[PDB]
Structure 1
Amino acid sequence: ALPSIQLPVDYNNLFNEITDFLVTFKQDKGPKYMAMLQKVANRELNSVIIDLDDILQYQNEKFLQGTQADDLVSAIQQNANHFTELFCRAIDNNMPLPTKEIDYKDDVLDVILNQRRLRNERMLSDRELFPPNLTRRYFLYFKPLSQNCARRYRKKAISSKPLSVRQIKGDFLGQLITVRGIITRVSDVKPAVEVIAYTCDQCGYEVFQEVNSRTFTPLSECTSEECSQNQTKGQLFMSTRASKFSAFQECKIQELSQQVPVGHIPRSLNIHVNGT
């Protein structure tokens, strides 16, 4: 069985605070991140660089008026992968409508949206369907904390100190760290699939499959409600037109000759850059 443990993080309160930050932050146009999301909706930008200096300033500002925060900067430097999903979910909730005449000549994703919505609606009245990542047209990143020069950086802010490949111990796994070193071998760009868009020969229903495993198994089984109730046992066909791809590059960072202790050999660390 799986035991249970008690951890004082409270992801729900953190998500509420995250939504408040994305709505009620204005750097010294409206809110900065709402303006950024407006630019994203206009398809003029696809990179949400969530700065950590801004989150620190937001926490400091609300510290004087209620301390309505749980040290988010210290809560995502400890586990950043989950908070990428949290930020993406908060952005999808507060995504403004476009305020520009964007050409929709290539709207395959929008076409699938409306087509599947109409097919579902013609039977919903009886006269989530889409994976969250499929609809997203933006990549979310984190900008690490800058220099603090204050008591806040009391050995904290591990993303502020540029480490070396040797100092990346095993207990840093999952944290948001920064390394300093010389790139040695960057690979070519390859399209890494995030969600496949299988289409069935009959039953008309297309089923998506999110994948982050470096290797997956195709479904090839029309488990849709109509196909199962009719027992047609249809097979699935991939549709790269309706699939979602993200550019993937696999760099490799070494360490400078000044960071290597005497008598040792420089180490290396694989880097997976993807998105923009």
Structure 2
Amino acid sequence: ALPSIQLPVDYNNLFNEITDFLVTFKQDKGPKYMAMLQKVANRELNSVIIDLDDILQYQNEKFLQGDLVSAIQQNANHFTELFCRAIDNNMPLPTKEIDYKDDVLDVILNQRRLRNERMLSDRTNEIRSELFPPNLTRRY
């Protein structure tokens, strides 16, 4: 057997849905997505509660211009995968200034990342002439 039964659900199409499903929204006036990703990157928040009202509102706007719930009714977790990994793909970096003694586990993992990055762009280059999981940089 080993079937591969096609069902109307998919991730690459859901991937593009996520790419368009970005910060951009009206009431969420600056979108609450934007300011709250700032807040969590200003390190005063970790729970970015994403309700379902604004989801259907974004769907309504996209439809009047040109189902997500019915999709999350079975897995709801591959959405936490794509959605979050794209919030990483679309993460405001320079939200605020940074210190070295303002926290713990945020300067330390940056130290590790960037120092092993120097050591790799030096050692693999000497040889010339591992992949930090996104979880490691969640902080929310």
How many residues were matched structurally?
Answer: 130
Cα 1:44/1:121, change in 2 over 3 Å:
closer
Give RMSD over aligned pairs.
2.5
Write the deviation string for residues 213-252 of structure 1: whole angstroms up to 9, x where unpaired.
xxxxxxxxxxxxxxxxxxxxxxxxxxxxxxxxxxxxxxxx
Higher alpha-carbon Rg: 1
Cα 1:36/1:115, change in 2 over 3 Å:
closer
Unaligned runs of 5+ residues in structure 1 are 136-276
On the 8 A contact 2:41/2:93 being kept in 1, the answer is: yes
On the 8 A contact 1:42/1:98 being kept in 2, the answer is: no
Aligned to 1:95: 91
TM-score, normalisation: structure 1: 0.41
Among 111, 118, 135, which residue is 2:114 paired with?
118
What are the equivalent positions in structure 2 for 1:1-276 lying under 5 Å apart? 2-27=2-27, 29-66=29-66, 71-101=67-97, 103-105=99-101, 107-126=103-122, 129-135=131-137
TM-score, normalisation: structure 2: 0.75
Distance in 2 separating the partners of 1:133 and 1:14: 21
Report deviation, 1:58: 0.8
Write the deviation string for residues 29-73 of structure 1: whole angstroms up to 9, x where unpaired.
52221121111111122111111110101111111121xxxx212
Aligned to 2:125: none
On the 8 A contact 2:28/2:54 being kept in 1, the answer is: no
% of aligned pairs identical? 100
On the 8 A contact 1:37/1:96 being kept in 2, the answer is: yes
On the 8 A contact 1:15/1:90 being kept in 2, the answer is: no
Write the deviation string for residues 62-107 of structure 1: whole angstroms up to 9, x where unpaired.
11121xxxx2122112321221112211111111024334554254
Report deviation, 1:131: 1.5
Report deviation, 1:21: 2.1
Cα 1:3/1:106, change in 2 over 3 Å:
farther
Write the deviation string for residues 146-183 of structure 1: whole angstroms up to 9, x where unpaired.
xxxxxxxxxxxxxxxxxxxxxxxxxxxxxxxxxxxxxx
Cα 1:31/1:19, change in 2 over 3 Å:
farther
Report deviation, 1:28: 7.0
Of structures 1 and 2, the one scoring higher in RCO (CA 8 A, sep 6+) is 2
Aligned to 2:14, what secondary structure does the other structure show?
Answer: helix
Aligned to 2:30, what secondary structure does the other structure show?
Answer: coil
Q: Considering fraction of residues, name the structure with more helix.
A: 2
Report deviation, 1:108: 4.0
More displaced 10-residue stretch of structure 1: 81-90 or 46-55: 81-90
Report deviation, 1:123: 4.3
Write the deviation string for residues 167-206 of structure 1: whole angstroms up to 9, x where unpaired.
xxxxxxxxxxxxxxxxxxxxxxxxxxxxxxxxxxxxxxxx
Aligned to 2:21, what secondary structure does the other structure show?
Answer: helix
Unaligned runs of 5+ residues in structure 2 are 123-129
On the 8 A contact 2:100/2:107 being kept in 1, the answer is: no
